Structure 1
């Protein structure tokens, strides 16, 4: 599993469940092309986004639909979504965990990169 995303809710102290997200990869014409998508499970995790052969060098963007998550909870959030943009696999294949911690008016994101 070369790319996994974990999302937590800082208000309820719980995984952020059923959070949608879309992964895009920058194309040659400098447009964002759809690469993968999914929703977080009961543990707040999204696995199986991609495979090692498909996940090539490039610039990728992970768009986490945080607005829809807060609104299904009755809260009106500040952000429309949380975006994470990074270059992947520039020095060879790595495993990437993108983690995000969400509040109505704030979020934090970090990456764990393993070889």
Structure 2
């Protein structure tokens, strides 16, 4: 149901070994841990959740961009990139990273 893809605009490559955490918004208005992982050699993170687990609600995908850049020896601007969205009854969250800029797009298919 949910997958995350990360690309590096400086090196022209997948962004490998990027930490990603996914949160669901609780009735509290606080963010509850939901799923996490490390992007693969292809820049992708599969297996985050299942159909039965991934209910309607408000989700946050936090991509640890600052750690990624530091591991490359490159100086970054952002602490992270947070992507917040409502799931309404397959989602791909894609991000393209530069040191002082990022973009994110959702690809939503049937």
TM bucket (normalised to shorter chain) is over 0.9
- The TM-score, its normalising length taken from structure 1, stands at 0.94
What is aligned with 2:73?
A: 74
What is aligned with 2:91?
A: 96
1:28 Cα deviation after fit? 0.7
Aligned length: 110
What is aligned with 1:84?
A: 83
> Structure 2 CA distance, aligned partners of 1:83 and 1:46?
16
1:75 Cα deviation after fit? 1.1
Q: Deviations over 1:78-106 (max 9, x none)?
A: 0010010000124xxxx000000000000
3-state SS of paired residue (1:63): strand
> Structure 1 CA distance, aligned partners of 2:26 and 2:108?
23
Moved over 4 A (4+): none
1:42 Cα deviation after fit? 0.2
Q: Deviations over 1:38-78 (max 9, x none)?
A: 00000000000000000000000000000000000111100
3-state SS of paired residue (1:76): coil
| Gap runs ≥5 in structure 1 | none
Q: How much is the aligned-residue C-alpha RMSD, in angstroms?
A: 0.6
